[PDB]
Design a binder for this molecule. Structure first.
Ligand SMILES: *[C@@H]1O[C@H](CO)[C@@H](O[C@@H]2O[C@H](CO)[C@@H](O[C@@H]3O[C@H](CO[C@H]4O[C@H](CO)[C@@H](O)[C@H](O)[C@@H]4O)[C@@H](O)[C@H](O[C@H]4O[C@H](CO)[C@@H](O)[C@H](O)[C@@H]4O)[C@@H]3O)[C@H](O)[C@H]2NC(C)=O)[C@H](O)[C@H]1NC(C)=O
Ligand code: NAG
Ligand code: NAG
Lengths: 48, 48
Protein backbone atom coordinates (compact mmCIF):
# COMPACT_ATOMS: atom_id res chain seq x y z
CA UNK A 1 0.00 0.00 0.00
CA UNK A 2 0.99 3.64 -0.64
CA UNK A 3 1.01 6.56 1.84
CA UNK A 4 -2.56 7.38 2.95
CA UNK A 5 -1.73 11.12 2.61
CA UNK A 6 0.24 14.07 3.97
CA UNK A 7 -1.17 15.76 7.08
CA UNK A 8 -2.91 19.10 6.33
CA UNK A 9 -2.51 22.20 8.45
CA UNK A 10 -6.27 22.81 8.64
CA UNK A 11 -5.66 26.49 9.58
CA UNK A 12 -4.62 26.91 5.86
CA UNK A 13 -7.72 25.21 4.31
CA UNK A 14 -10.50 27.62 3.23
CA UNK A 15 -10.58 31.47 3.43
CA UNK A 16 -11.18 33.59 6.61
CA UNK A 17 -14.65 34.97 5.62
CA UNK A 18 -15.43 32.12 3.13
CA UNK A 19 -19.17 31.43 2.70
CA UNK A 20 -20.87 28.39 1.06
CA UNK A 21 -20.22 29.79 -2.50
CA UNK A 22 -16.48 28.80 -2.27
CA UNK A 23 -15.44 25.10 -2.15
CA UNK A 24 -13.02 23.75 0.47
CA UNK A 25 -9.34 23.41 -0.58
CA UNK A 26 -5.90 23.90 1.02
CA UNK A 27 -2.90 25.93 -0.22
CA UNK A 28 0.17 23.89 -1.38
CA UNK A 29 2.11 24.80 1.82
CA UNK A 30 -0.75 23.36 3.98
CA UNK A 31 0.43 19.76 3.25
CA UNK A 32 3.09 18.79 5.81
CA UNK A 33 5.25 15.84 6.86
CA UNK A 34 7.13 15.29 3.58
CA UNK A 35 10.66 15.95 2.33
CA UNK A 36 12.90 15.42 -0.71
CA UNK A 37 16.51 14.58 -1.59
CA UNK A 38 18.44 13.87 -4.83
CA UNK A 39 18.95 10.27 -6.03
CA UNK A 40 22.16 11.26 -7.89
CA UNK A 41 25.55 9.78 -6.94
CA UNK A 42 28.57 9.76 -9.34
CA UNK A 43 26.36 11.03 -12.26
CA UNK A 44 23.85 8.10 -11.83
CA UNK A 45 20.41 8.09 -10.15
CA UNK A 46 20.14 5.31 -7.52
CA UNK A 47 17.03 3.09 -7.83
CA UNK A 48 15.59 0.34 -5.64
CA UNK B 1 -3.10 -3.75 -1.72
CA UNK B 2 -4.55 -6.38 -4.13
CA UNK B 3 -8.30 -6.93 -4.62
CA UNK B 4 -9.52 -10.52 -5.25
CA UNK B 5 -12.85 -11.69 -6.67
CA UNK B 6 -14.32 -15.22 -6.68
CA UNK B 7 -17.78 -16.19 -7.95
CA UNK B 8 -20.15 -19.06 -8.65
CA UNK B 9 -23.28 -19.07 -10.83
CA UNK B 10 -23.76 -22.87 -10.25
CA UNK B 11 -23.38 -24.62 -6.87
CA UNK B 12 -22.31 -22.83 -3.65
CA UNK B 13 -18.44 -22.91 -3.56
CA UNK B 14 -16.97 -20.01 -5.57
CA UNK B 15 -14.06 -20.07 -8.05
CA UNK B 16 -11.45 -17.37 -8.76
CA UNK B 17 -12.48 -14.70 -11.30
CA UNK B 18 -9.61 -12.19 -11.13
CA UNK B 19 -7.19 -10.29 -8.89
CA UNK B 20 -6.35 -6.60 -9.27
CA UNK B 21 -3.46 -4.67 -7.79
CA UNK B 22 -4.73 -1.28 -6.49
CA UNK B 23 -1.95 -0.11 -4.13
CA UNK B 24 -4.63 1.51 -1.92
CA UNK B 25 -6.82 0.18 0.86
CA UNK B 26 -10.48 -0.21 -0.22
CA UNK B 27 -12.75 0.93 2.63
CA UNK B 28 -16.40 1.00 1.51
CA UNK B 29 -18.87 -0.94 -0.58
CA UNK B 30 -22.41 -0.16 -1.63
CA UNK B 31 -25.17 -2.16 -3.36
CA UNK B 32 -26.72 0.22 -5.91
CA UNK B 33 -30.53 0.66 -5.81
CA UNK B 34 -32.24 -0.72 -8.94
CA UNK B 35 -35.23 1.17 -10.41
CA UNK B 36 -37.86 -0.74 -12.37
CA UNK B 37 -41.49 -0.56 -13.56
CA UNK B 38 -41.72 -4.30 -12.52
CA UNK B 39 -40.32 -6.33 -9.49
CA UNK B 40 -43.10 -5.71 -6.88
CA UNK B 41 -46.18 -7.33 -5.24
CA UNK B 42 -48.68 -5.20 -7.24
CA UNK B 43 -47.18 -6.18 -10.69
CA UNK B 44 -45.28 -9.55 -10.71
CA UNK B 45 -44.49 -10.60 -7.06
CA UNK B 46 -40.72 -10.74 -7.86
CA UNK B 47 -37.99 -9.39 -5.53
CA UNK B 48 -34.30 -8.44 -5.50
C1 LIG C 1 -13.84 14.99 -11.30
O1 LIG C 1 -14.94 14.96 -10.34
C2 LIG C 1 -15.33 16.29 -9.86
C3 LIG C 1 -16.42 16.14 -8.80
O2 LIG C 1 -15.92 15.34 -7.73
C4 LIG C 1 -15.79 17.12 -11.06
O3 LIG C 1 -15.95 18.51 -10.61
C5 LIG C 1 -17.29 19.05 -10.78
O4 LIG C 1 -17.48 19.37 -12.18
C6 LIG C 1 -18.76 20.03 -12.52
C7 LIG C 1 -18.77 20.28 -14.03
O5 LIG C 1 -17.60 21.04 -14.39
C8 LIG C 1 -18.93 21.31 -11.68
O6 LIG C 1 -20.26 21.84 -12.04
C9 LIG C 1 -20.79 23.13 -11.54
O7 LIG C 1 -21.93 23.52 -12.37
C10 LIG C 1 -22.63 24.77 -11.97
C11 LIG C 1 -23.72 25.10 -12.99
O8 LIG C 1 -24.49 23.89 -13.30
C12 LIG C 1 -25.72 24.18 -14.03
O9 LIG C 1 -25.42 24.88 -15.29
C13 LIG C 1 -24.64 24.11 -16.30
C14 LIG C 1 -24.47 24.99 -17.55
O10 LIG C 1 -23.77 26.20 -17.21
C15 LIG C 1 -25.36 22.79 -16.61
O11 LIG C 1 -24.53 21.96 -17.46
C16 LIG C 1 -25.61 22.02 -15.30
O12 LIG C 1 -26.27 20.76 -15.60
C17 LIG C 1 -26.45 22.86 -14.31
O13 LIG C 1 -27.76 23.14 -14.88
C18 LIG C 1 -21.62 25.92 -11.88
O14 LIG C 1 -22.26 27.08 -11.29
C19 LIG C 1 -20.44 25.51 -11.01
O15 LIG C 1 -19.51 26.66 -10.89
C20 LIG C 1 -18.56 26.67 -9.77
O16 LIG C 1 -17.72 27.88 -9.87
C21 LIG C 1 -18.44 29.17 -9.73
C22 LIG C 1 -17.43 30.33 -9.85
O17 LIG C 1 -16.76 30.29 -11.13
C23 LIG C 1 -19.20 29.21 -8.40
O18 LIG C 1 -20.10 30.35 -8.38
C24 LIG C 1 -20.07 27.96 -8.20
O19 LIG C 1 -20.63 27.98 -6.86
C25 LIG C 1 -19.26 26.66 -8.39
O20 LIG C 1 -18.27 26.60 -7.33
C26 LIG C 1 -19.75 24.27 -11.59
O21 LIG C 1 -19.33 24.53 -12.96
C27 LIG C 1 -18.80 20.97 -10.18
O22 LIG C 1 -18.91 22.17 -9.37
C28 LIG C 1 -17.44 20.31 -9.91
N1 LIG C 1 -17.31 19.96 -8.50
C29 LIG C 1 -16.16 20.09 -7.83
C30 LIG C 1 -16.17 19.62 -6.37
O23 LIG C 1 -15.16 20.55 -8.36
C31 LIG C 1 -14.76 17.13 -12.20
O24 LIG C 1 -15.35 17.79 -13.35
C32 LIG C 1 -14.33 15.71 -12.57
N2 LIG C 1 -13.29 15.72 -13.59
C33 LIG C 1 -13.17 14.76 -14.50
C34 LIG C 1 -12.07 14.94 -15.55
O25 LIG C 1 -13.90 13.78 -14.48
C1 NAG D 1 -19.88 34.73 -1.56
O1 NAG D 1 -21.08 35.13 -0.83
C2 NAG D 1 -20.98 36.38 -0.04
C3 NAG D 1 -22.35 36.66 0.60
O2 NAG D 1 -23.37 36.73 -0.42
C4 NAG D 1 -20.48 37.52 -0.94
O3 NAG D 1 -20.16 38.66 -0.10
C5 NAG D 1 -19.19 37.14 -1.69
O4 NAG D 1 -18.80 38.25 -2.56
C6 NAG D 1 -19.40 35.86 -2.50
N1 NAG D 1 -18.15 35.47 -3.15
C7 NAG D 1 -18.12 34.86 -4.34
C8 NAG D 1 -16.75 34.38 -4.82
O5 NAG D 1 -19.14 34.67 -4.99
C1 NAG E 1 -48.91 -11.37 -5.29
O1 NAG E 1 -49.18 -12.39 -4.27
C2 NAG E 1 -50.34 -12.08 -3.39
C3 NAG E 1 -50.50 -13.21 -2.36
O2 NAG E 1 -50.71 -14.48 -3.01
C4 NAG E 1 -51.59 -11.84 -4.24
O3 NAG E 1 -52.65 -11.32 -3.41
C5 NAG E 1 -51.34 -10.80 -5.35
O4 NAG E 1 -52.54 -10.69 -6.17
C6 NAG E 1 -50.14 -11.21 -6.21
N1 NAG E 1 -49.88 -10.20 -7.24
C7 NAG E 1 -49.62 -10.52 -8.50
C8 NAG E 1 -49.25 -9.36 -9.43
O5 NAG E 1 -49.68 -11.68 -8.90
Amino acid sequence: EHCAGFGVDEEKCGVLDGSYNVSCLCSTDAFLGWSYDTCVSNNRCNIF
Amino acid sequence: GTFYAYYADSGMPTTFLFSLYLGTLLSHYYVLPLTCNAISSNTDNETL
